[PDB]
């Protein structure tokens, strides 16, 4: 149904996050042991290592154009690095518990982070100030993401909700700044992940109910489209295939599953005998995927 063409594998202690560089053949991998690796997956070479956290590092992301990346740790810190000069530029402090995700905005000079402290924070990485604290979730915020073209954020929480936030107010300035638009109800256990489709008005969410839910939205409403059923343990992560009508999910059941976007039927399951999956991502341009698991990271194509 589909074959996995493995292009590169790192054997390491448990990996939590991975981020593709947009133009270079690199991935960052953030590890349970607190260290960040920079790999060239075409040569199979470890280019650098970054040690600026204590404990697991779950958040990791490249800036789209700048020589920067950002990391978020269980030590509550959001660190901003320069990978050309190879130094930690500064720490963004404010979160009071584990940082789960951290990403750069594609246009504004912003960093997005979310935390077990029940908040989503938006930082300005030029002023190094926190410019917005999004409150409302009643449990850990496990994931947050910027919309690729609209002034929206989607977030997922162990409070069993997926929230869509309107941050048009924060944008106009350059808490009216952020207002919750949708509190999406559907999961009957905690939600671990949420993702926007790159070009369509779709949302994926996945959680401890073992479900991947597909949502559609307009400017004025949202609705649950369908559910992907089959995982037999917590789903850690999910995403849209950018250029095919497919959904991908990764689970503590030690499988990566591909689903039909239009039918939500199973297309292909990939299994590892001993490794739980903690994260999957897709390259912003190429049909290239990466997955973090108990024994390292793998980069692969799907055919």
Curated annotation (Swiss-Prot):
This is Putative coatomer subunit alpha. It is found in: Cytoplasm; Golgi apparatus membrane. Transmembrane segments: none annotated. WD repeats lie at residues 10-51, 52-91, 94-135, 136-174, 186-225, 230-269, 272-303. The coatomer is a cytosolic protein complex that binds to dilysine motifs and reversibly associates with Golgi non-clathrin-coated vesicles, which further mediate biosynthetic protein transport from the ER, via the Golgi up to the trans Golgi network. Coatomer complex is required for budding from Golgi membranes, and is essential for the retrograde Golgi-to-ER transport of dilysine-tagged proteins. It comes from Schizosaccharomyces pombe (strain 972 / ATCC 24843) (Fission yeast). The chain holds residues 1 to 327 of 1207 of the full protein. Oligomeric complex that consists of at least the alpha, beta, beta', gamma, delta, epsilon and zeta subunits. It comes from the Eukaryota.
